[PDB]
Design a protein around this ligand. Sequence first.
Ligand SMILES: NC(=O)C1=CN([C@@H]2O[C@H](COP(=O)(O)OP(=O)(O)OC[C@H]3O[C@@H](n4cnc5c(N)ncnc54)[C@H](OP(=O)(O)O)[C@@H]3O)[C@@H](O)[C@H]2O)C=CC1
Ligand SMILES: CCCCCCCCCCCC(=O)OC[C@H](COP(=O)(O)OCC[N+](C)(C)C)OC(=O)CCCCCCCCCCC
Ligand code: SF4
Lengths: 115, 175, 451, 440, 88, 359
Amino acid sequence: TNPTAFAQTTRYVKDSTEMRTLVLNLYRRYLRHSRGFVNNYNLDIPASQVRTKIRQEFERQRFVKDLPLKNVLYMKAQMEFQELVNFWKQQCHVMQYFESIKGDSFVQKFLKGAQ
Amino acid sequence: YSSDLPTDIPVLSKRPHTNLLDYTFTTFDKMKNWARKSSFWPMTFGLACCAVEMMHVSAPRYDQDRLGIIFRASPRQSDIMIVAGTVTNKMAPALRQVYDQMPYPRWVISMGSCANGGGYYHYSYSVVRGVDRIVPVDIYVPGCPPTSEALMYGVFQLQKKMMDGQTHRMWYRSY
Amino acid sequence: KRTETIDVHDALGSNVRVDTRGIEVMRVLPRLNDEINEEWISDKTRFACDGLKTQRLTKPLIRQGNTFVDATWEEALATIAEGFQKVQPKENEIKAIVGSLTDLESIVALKDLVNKLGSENVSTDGDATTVPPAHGADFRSNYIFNSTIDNIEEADQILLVGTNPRHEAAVLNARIRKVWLRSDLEVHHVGEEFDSTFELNHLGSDVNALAKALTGEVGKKLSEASKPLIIIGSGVTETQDAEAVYATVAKFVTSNANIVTPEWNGFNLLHREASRVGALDVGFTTQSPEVANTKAKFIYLLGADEIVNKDIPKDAFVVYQGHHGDLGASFADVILPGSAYTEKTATYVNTEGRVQSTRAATNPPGVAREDWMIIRALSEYLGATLPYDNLYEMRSRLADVAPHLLRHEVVEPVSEGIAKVGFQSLVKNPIENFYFTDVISKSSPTMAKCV
Amino acid sequence: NDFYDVNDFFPVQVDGIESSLGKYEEFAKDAHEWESWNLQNEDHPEYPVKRTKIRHFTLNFGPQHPAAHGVLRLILELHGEEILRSDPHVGLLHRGTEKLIESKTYMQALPYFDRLDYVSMMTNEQVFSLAVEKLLNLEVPERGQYIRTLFGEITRVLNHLMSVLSHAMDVGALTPFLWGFEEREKLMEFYERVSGARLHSAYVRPGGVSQDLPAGLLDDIYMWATQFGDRLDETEELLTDSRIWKQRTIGIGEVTAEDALNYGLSGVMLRGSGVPFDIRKSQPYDAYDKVDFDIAVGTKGDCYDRYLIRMTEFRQSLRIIEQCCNQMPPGPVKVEDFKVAPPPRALMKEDMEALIHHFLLYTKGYAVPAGETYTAIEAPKGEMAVYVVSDGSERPYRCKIRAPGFAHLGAFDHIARGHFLPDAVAIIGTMDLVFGEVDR
Amino acid sequence: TDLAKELVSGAPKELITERVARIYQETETWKIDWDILNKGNRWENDLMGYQSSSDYMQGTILKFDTREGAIRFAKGQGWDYYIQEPKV
Amino acid sequence: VSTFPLKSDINITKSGKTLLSVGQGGRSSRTGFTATVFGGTGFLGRVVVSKLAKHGTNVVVPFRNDRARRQLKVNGDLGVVNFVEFDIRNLKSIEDSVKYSDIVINLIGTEHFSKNFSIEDVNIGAAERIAKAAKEAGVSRLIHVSSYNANPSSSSDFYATKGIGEQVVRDNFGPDATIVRPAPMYFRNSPFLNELLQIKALGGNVIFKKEVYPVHALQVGEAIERIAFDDATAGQTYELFGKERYSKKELREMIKHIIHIGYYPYSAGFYLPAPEPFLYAFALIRQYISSQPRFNVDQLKRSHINQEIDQSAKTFTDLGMVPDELSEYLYRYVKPHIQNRTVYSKEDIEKLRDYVNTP
Ligand SMILES: NC(=O)C1=CN([C@@H]2O[C@H](COP(=O)(O)OP(=O)(O)OC[C@H]3O[C@@H](n4cnc5c(N)ncnc54)[C@H](OP(=O)(O)O)[C@@H]3O)[C@@H](O)[C@H]2O)C=CC1
Ligand SMILES: CCCCCCCCCCCC(=O)OC[C@H](COP(=O)(O)OCC[N+](C)(C)C)OC(=O)CCCCCCCCCCC
Ligand code: SF4
């Protein structure tokens, strides 16, 4: 058995500081492959746009607190990196990943049906 | 401007041949459709238990080859696509890529329950509920799995549709 | 599919179990509750289910001539406001009548809309001759079963103040009959004559029969009873001598001390609607005969049906919001469909003061909305917008009304040290047809076989 | 790093470079043009060579390949024609069977098992029937267990015809594929006569079988048995001793017996490596102890050995079919407990007790006493087992299915490493993959 | 209890906020189910009268064993909930 | 689109029908309408039909080509998309597609007359029959699509007949009918762009000197969708166009530069200076020898006429939609025809546009 490209062992990290440095390198890894993600998936958005969306992704969830839940968030984000870099997700899924997305007053929701 | 459109002129599928051209372009349509009616080359898109029946048609008992049916693996060489078996969500994007590569004319046959409307796995988190959400379908073969004769019957009905094609007369009369 | 909810036909609010199928209620069965009903529900409750499958208001309706037409919500919420300022009602020219089946969330939320437009001609669809309620909405003990249902089987003397418990509360009528078999129970009849499952210590038919009751041997056993019972039906306030009823009795409750113990209260009320107690616990009633005399130019009906004796001016602007087509619907001008009690999460209060809500069973039919949601929707069209934007906020408003409104299945009583002060404030059978009492029964195809 | 990458002879100290018209530094600012003045030889192992990491040729042995028995995105990384790393992508047929069974009764969950393996039906539902029988603590009568043994063999013949001949077809021998498929048409007649549907026979239900054998079936089963004996011979004529068939398979995909245990291989790809283990013998069940048969064990652990074992499984299975026809006992075909089996229709409409159990069986289902079980049977692919947890309810709580094709496909990297791209087809064929079973 | 496990369960954002789960008891064990949607819970299909639905939690019921066990679960997932005490 | 298109769940049409929408706006939801989209199998129809079906509106699509209607059924659910075989010369088949229809949309319009139809017979004769027949069946709303330069007195056949198409409808359907004028839309397989991408474009200088106001076809696809669900927009005239002005010759070099197409443009046939009589003669000759719709004499005149905005009409903002510019979408729609891909973003189109204008 030979593990695939961009693989890491699943390890239960027992340090607060080490997890901080692991994440920081990971964020650079996404930015390094910014040009590739455009050329691999033929995305309509340019390289700067992907970095902008990646930053919006990394900025979004930086305030988590639980270390047992830090490793889980680092584990699955590693899988997202591994799936994307190995060119595993189809073209459509990446296009729709960035294509997702102010509310309305009570009268507006009352009339049509609300939820 | 000056315009006067009649009202009693019928539709194409009901319009009888009147002059000699209406017989010429009907000859071209039958001759061309007869070629596609006979050289019926589907694509081996077996996915699930429905695929066993699609093999048994090629078996010596039924011998699809006698009717001019030769499965072609590549989409380019195949003018039909018998979608047999469950179409999971993980497959649906891939199925569209295979379908879009078939040069025109192209037909799709949905065999079995899973390909038609979801089948047994209709309430599954990872099963497309009917392949008609992804690719247009020209005939639905019902079964679980449809018997080797049921698929042949479904093939025959689609053949009867192809022999009804009126493309080159449509240019003369409807275009 | 089963849901646990409550009846709204009478004022008991007994716990029931509703068995639905998609968007249709099939059957209603009782769910055990020793505090109220304990496995029994009258034929009215369980055979009015199909009344929700016909006559339903599913769309806004607008009058153009003398026949309602199908109109959107945008126009309906505007035709009211458009014609609102055509007649420009004054302070007492706006009237609001609340029906028997109107829930408490609409009852409270309507006052805020009414108040911001400056009106006080608000009350239920009863026929109380005294414009302020004779018991008055001032104190809780004035209009609640201070004993509650679980304090009936341990009574000795029971007084029927013009009532027919067989036709006014079937569940409690058998409860008295069950006690009447083994115990030494004594019940005396004071009111219109009727037919009962059990004989009574019958007296007569007039009010003057009760004059000699509390001072003779009829009231002597009341003094002798360790746990005496006094019950006043919903048919008292309607009567001409309703004011005479409370003064006569509460004088007998302010005299003895065994009637009101740290563990017993001998005076109780027996209403028949599921919205009267909710109205009184929130002060949704008028307090001036002059206001009730005004020829109001804008009467906004909210579930109200029994308004034949209510003088609705012909020129007035009548808007009816409800979930059926019945007596109250004909008077309307712009109709706003509401919700059936099974289709809404409505907080109801029974005649014993217990606050019981409902769990939603089905979506409202057609394009109907929740009862109160129309009022807030109607608020924006009149410049009187309410600050309530979700059902929790409507319960948040109920917190300011009272603390008991937010206690589900929890009864807040009146303390013995105060209920006696509420006693100091004080010092014909109301029902014609048993099977034509509420809106759902009248429209029920099943009850057409009960006539 | 991630995007690009960058000694024997003595490190020789040479300084003071001079020419005949000055020093090195005097003409340093001009010598870049002079290619014969450079001081960095290109043969030096330490010479800075910075080359981008261009990825190796990664062909997709993807879903649209006739060799695939389903939809398999077999991501093959190859340099030249050898195989470096293989990462199968299963899941393109994950219908979520394990999720759906949790919401259906024990009788309604049986038809799900015929749809796992498209060719080995009555063996698949036998392992769920045994699992429920083990929990129900009820034992099938004798004639019931003989019907399951006979159709256990017929199913094995049906499965191996799909496995061996497609493996032969994928190599390139088209003819044996068609000779055998007529026999499958002849064998599928037997399935259709007892159950009704050609392929998915919801026949073996927990508590025996569905319906008794139709009269004269044994005569037709036996008559096929005499004729079938020659069919293997011609199959062995064009495959067994042919030198092209031997070349394609001999020494291809070598699996050690010690290493086969490590990956948990079972079935033919565990006796191909020399281990003489068989589940029908380790745990007898359903009238397998009564019959006699010889198991086959290889010695080299390659595709040709597994072919010989599979061919032997034809004759040994045909051997039992003769014994099952001969030794057939009389009696019932399902447990005579109305709570786990429908009553006969002659009696359902005559006896009040019969009608009640018919009504109650099909609306609520029977309740399985609490516990857990793991019953493994010799499926034609290998050890197929179900893990079933009973929560005292008429619906199973957990139903995990062990697919022999699932574990084998995992060991593809260990087996196919170092072989050529044509050997990838041979390795897949000898694994007997049915991706309905893999992605259960 | 203090853990924001909703970031690992993969559930949609609407379960945390816009849905309410009832912890009831039908006679020895407790169950959890989600209250119905305001609109779109059940609309009659205009083709064949099928009971269509957009609520994906209508068919979900979790059989628990003890009350505190159910409450532990609801807090663990970050679920809004209320508890219905059975009548004695 | 978003999650639910209807402004209100209950909508009353001009005919008194009370339609109640159900569901949360998914594929299995409904809106209670029945929008017959004539000419739905065309370029514009496949966008009009797609949006209507996904939100639950029944679509009746009358077709004359049998093999082109198959793909329209994917968009809707079971029974949502219906088909009627018809011809404009078969009056009875027209009345089959309007009997149950609450919305009728007209998209039929040609630029080349054939051996069976003239330009008038389609932009008028089809439109007149379609509009008048729809009224007799109590159709609540009619929506029409004409040229962006409709003019009754224009010397161009297309513009002259399209303008008369506006009059003849309003004399047949009545005051309720609506007219929408779309600017040249750009989308996948757009006839507006297919002329620019063709390598052998004889008379390329003459054809491409015309001016336009390109509009994104998706917005026009939603523009009809917004109008369809609203009764407030009856009897109007709408002209839909894009803010930033572009010319074909400006686009043709902009298009070619993205595809990077030294000697090649001079040889393959990119620039074919041909005499004006030859272009007129070539179009006439093919008009009797061709079998597929080629470049027509009418498009020789239209190349001399620039697009004109009519101030009596209403823009996108009248419907609450802000039109999108060709700069933000021109690259992706020619991305099929184009080391490291250079993605020409919205702003960078100007910098490309700068490079074209610089001599
Ligand atoms: N961006 C654009 O495409 C432009 C839009 N317009 C105008 O908008 C309108 C929409 O057309 P569009 O879809 O864009 O382009 P198309 O020419 O492809 O649309 C033609 C549609 O109308 C049908 N049609 C044409 N003639 C007949 C006829 N005699 N009988 C029956 N059907 C006929 C066609 O049927 P079928 O295809 O099935 O044979 C097709 O459905 C047109 O009038 C167009 O001139 C204005 C300038 C350019
Ligand atoms: C030089 C070029 C290469 C060779 C060309 C020939 C290739 C094969 C042609 C296939 C024809 C085909 O398919 O004809 C057969 C089809 C099948 O009948 P159907 O489709 O059900 O319609 C027929 C039934 N109707 C019309 C009532 C619906 O029609 C016919 O019966 C056509 C009528 C018979 C024609 C006989 C007279 C003409 C003889 C001409 C030969 C001398
Ligand atoms: S329809 Fe039946 S036989 Fe066909 S793939 Fe689905 S489950 Fe298998």
